[PDB]
Amino acid sequence: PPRGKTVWFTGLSGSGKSSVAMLVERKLLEKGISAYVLDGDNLRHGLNADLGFSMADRAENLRRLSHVATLLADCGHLVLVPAISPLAEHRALARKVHADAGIDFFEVFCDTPLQDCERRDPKGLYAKARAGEITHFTGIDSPYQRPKNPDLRLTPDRSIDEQAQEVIDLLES
Amino acid sequence: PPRGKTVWFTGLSGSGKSSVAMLVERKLLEKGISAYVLDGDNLRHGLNADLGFSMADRAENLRRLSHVATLLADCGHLVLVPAISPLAEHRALARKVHADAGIDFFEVFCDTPLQDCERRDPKGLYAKARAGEITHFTGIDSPYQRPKNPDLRLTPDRSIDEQAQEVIDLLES
Ligand SMILES: Nc1ncnc2c1ncn2[C@@H]1O[C@H](COP(=O)(O)OP(=O)(O)O)[C@@H](O)[C@H]1O
Ligand SMILES: Nc1ncnc2c1ncn2[C@@H]1O[C@H](COP(=O)(O)OP(=O)(O)O)[C@@H](O)[C@H]1O
Ligand SMILES: Nc1ncnc2c1ncn2[C@@H]1O[C@H](COP(=O)(O)OS(=O)(=O)O)[C@@H](O)[C@H]1O
Ligand SMILES: Nc1ncnc2c1ncn2[C@@H]1O[C@H](COP(=O)(O)OS(=O)(=O)O)[C@@H](O)[C@H]1O
């Protein structure tokens, strides 16, 4: 097989990481490209069921995710990782795990304003955080460090379909 | 893709787990069957780099490995897991993670006697353990519970090639 590669999505909760990732996955699969979405949230329920949201656990979650991505990539998949990845050092770690495994690594920043993300508020998490029912929530009372150099920055200027198509164009260029 | 399955190898250090697993991988791949080895020792240098050989770390190591296997299996691979898995409960846990994920799970016991494993001694570890330079070494001063009912027991009667073929025959029946 060709060895695979990893697309790592960072951004606020509700910024479109999973949507874009899922759509990219379908588009690729429809053209016989074996793509797989390795979702921070889903893994948190099995492999990463023992971790929370302290910066240390998130780093651990993400460290683990980064390894699993390189493993799926080594099996020949195009891996899509939507995960908040709130700190530069989180992304720097993932990148280094990929460098060390000799797997191509692309960073995509889903740069949707906080306003838009909670105007969306799809799982009700912003509301809970503003109410004090969740704490250390990214963008509210836990920081989000903006990537300075992503491979691609997505903005809420276009449809999810078209955002997926930009990810694909990044991969095919 | 149809869903993959897992072959889980248990046995003493130097009993042939990795050798058989690698050879099974190659044989399968040469026939256009997508196979992948998750080797305990290799992954201890990345995903599981944070774990040692306390019984607790070994359980965690093997818990993690079991989740990764099911996930690669779900992607359609035939997953080969050589790892000592020294306790019955370790194997029972992996089996359950697989049952729960609806992935077929086969247990292979590489039943080479301690004496033979020591007499092989490929990485010098038994010697270090006898000398007191390593502690909690499986079979010397850390236990190995022998599987009561593996799907396949491999014995030092055959070449590694032939042992691989038996694993394959097990899968193809
Ligand atoms: N470019 C876009 N245009 C319109 N709506 C979007 C866009 N990106 C995301 N959305 C909507 O906003 C929400 C983003 O949620 P999701 O992708 O789950 O965010 P995340 O995975 O980053 O937490 C979704 O309901 C999606 O429908
Ligand atoms: N059936 C066999 N016949 C001959 N040699 C074997 C057989 N099984 C294993 N070996 C040898 O014994 C050693 C087992 O090593 P390995 O597969 O690394 O064990 P483990 O992964 O179980 O530690 C290897 O050096 C291999 O050369
Ligand atoms: N305190 C929190 N901050 C951000 N997300 C949270 C928090 N608590 C729960 N979550 C949930 O966990 C998901 C984020 O998971 P990841 O992307 O795996 O997080 S990350 O920070 O470690 O990268 C969010 O989509 C949200 O659904
Ligand atoms: N104390 C030890 N006990 C057993 N194996 C060890 C030990 N220290 C280092 N090793 C090396 O680590 C490998 C064992 O790793 P695992 O298969 O991952 O162990 S397991 O118990 O957690 O299943 C061995 O093949 C050997 O190379």
Author numbering:
A (entry chain B), B (entry chain A): 440 to 612
Give the article text.
The CysN polypeptide also contains a C-terminal APS (adenosine-5’-phosphosulfate) kinase domain (CysC), which exists as a separate enzyme in other bacteria and plants. Alternatively, APS can be phosphorylated at the 3′-position by APS kinase (CysC) to generate 3′-phosphoadenosine 5′-phosphosulfate (PAPS), a substrate for sulfotransferases that catalyze the transfer of the sulfate group onto a variety of metabolites. The structure of CysC is characterized by the canonical α/β-purine nucleotide binding fold, consisting of a five-stranded parallel β-sheet which is flanked on both sides by two α-helices. Structural features typical of APS kinases of this fold family, including the P-loop required for ATP binding (residues 452–458 in CysC), the conserved LDGD motif (residues 477–480) and the lid region (residues 552–581) above the P-loop which closes upon substrate binding, are also found in CysC.
To obtain more insights into the active site of CysC from M. tuberculosis and modes of ligand binding, we co-crystallized CysC in the presence of ADP, APS and Mg2+ and determined the structure of this complex. Superimposition of the individual subunits resulted in an rmsd of 0.9 Å. This relatively high value is, however, due to the shift of one loop in response to APS binding. In the ternary complex ADP is bound in a well-defined conformation in the canonical nucleotide binding site in the vicinity of the P-loop and the enzyme-ADP interactions are well preserved compared to the binary complex. We note, however, that in spite of the presence of 2 mM Mg2+ during crystallization no electron density indicating a bound Mg2+ ion is observed in the vicinity of the diphosphate group. The APS adenine ring is sandwiched between Phe492 and Phe576 in a π-stacking arrangement, an interaction conserved in other complexes of APS kinase. The phosphate group interacts with the side chain of Arg483 and the main chain nitrogen atom of Ile523 and the sulfate group forms hydrogen bonds to the side chains of Arg483 and Arg497 and the main chain nitrogen atom of Ser524.
